Amino acid sequence: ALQQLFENNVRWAEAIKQEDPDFFAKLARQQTPEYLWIGCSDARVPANEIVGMLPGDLFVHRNVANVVLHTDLNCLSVIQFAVDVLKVKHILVTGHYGCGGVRASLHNDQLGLIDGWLRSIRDLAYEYREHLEQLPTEEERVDRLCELNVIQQVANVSHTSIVQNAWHRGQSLSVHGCIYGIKDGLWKNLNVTVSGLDQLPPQYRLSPL
Template structure:
C-alpha cells in the first residue's frame, strides 16, 4: 500500500490527459528561493557588519529583480521617466520608494533635514526645476512626518549646531508666527507634529508661487500635494493643500 501511495503522488503517475498545471512552475520556484534569500537577509553578515550585509543584500536583491524581469535594469539604464517628485525629510524612517510601494525609476527624490523648501535654497530649487522642466513629472509631493527631530529642535532656540541652526531658521520663524496655536497644544510631541505640518503648508505655498511650477500647472496640469507621514503606523495623510488635481 505504501508503495502505491508513493507512486500516485509522484509526478510520473499523473495522467497524461490531465489539464491541471503543476502547483508551481520551475521559474516560480526559483523566484521564491531568490525572494527568500532577499527577504530573510544574510543574518550572519548583518550581525558582523551592517555595511557588508548591505552589499550582500544588494547582490541578492539585484539577482532577484533580474530573475523577475531580465530587462528591468536594462530599461532603467536607458532613461528615467518618474511620475512623482518627492520632497521629503532625510530621516531614515521615511524611505519614499518603500513606503509608497513603488519601484526604482518611479520617484525622483530630494530630501533634507525637516523637508524645508525655501525659495532661497538653490539645491532644492535645482532639483525641483530639473524634475518639472526636464523630466516632466506629473506630481510633486512634499512630505512632512511625525517624530521629526528638526521640528522638535525648532520648538526652542537652544543651539543644535552652526549649520543646523541656520538650516532650521525658517521653522523657528514659523513657530514664532504661529505661537498661539502651538502653545494651545498640551505637550511638545503634539506641538512638533503641528509645526511639521505648518512647515509642509509653508513649503507648498513656496512651490505654488514658483514660476516654472505655475507654468506647468497651467500648461500640463502638474499637481502639487502636501502630506504627513505617521512613523508610528506607516500611513500617509493627505493635507488637501496645493492643487486640487
C-alpha cells in the same frame, strides 16, 4: 562593516534578474517618473517603500525637515529638473510626525550649522505661537508644527516661477502636502493641493515670460 551592504545588493539585484532579467536594462533606457518626492532625510521615511513604488517612479529630494527655500539651489534644481525636463505630474511634499528638525526649532538648544537651515520653521512657530501655546503637550505642538511646515512648503513650491511657468505653458502639475506617521506607517493627505495659478495669492503670482 560595509560588506553586508554589498552582499545585500548583489542578492537584491540577482533576485530581481531571476524574476525579470531585463528589469534594469529596460529601466536604464529612459527617465519617466510621474512624481517628485520632497521629504525629510529621516531614515524612517523612505519614499518608495512608503507609497509602494518601484525604481524609476519617484524622483527624490530629501533634506532635514523637508524644507523648500527660495534661494536654495539644491532643492530648487531638483524641482526645476523634475518640472522642466522630466515633466513630472505631481510634486509630493511629505513631512512626518515627530520630526527632529521641527522639534529642534521649538527648542532653544544650538545644534550648530543646522540652526540656520531650520530657522524658517522657527519663524513658523513664532507666526503660530498663539495657536501652538493652546496645545497642552509638546508632542502635540511638534506634530502640529510638522503639519504647518508641510503646508508652508507646499505654498513655497507653488510660488516658484518654475511651477508657475509650467502652468503658464499649459503643463499639468499638482503640488501636494502629505504627512507620514512614523508611529503607524500611514501616509496622510493634508489636503492642500495646488494645481493652478488661480489658487495663488496675488502677491505671489508672476506674469508669463
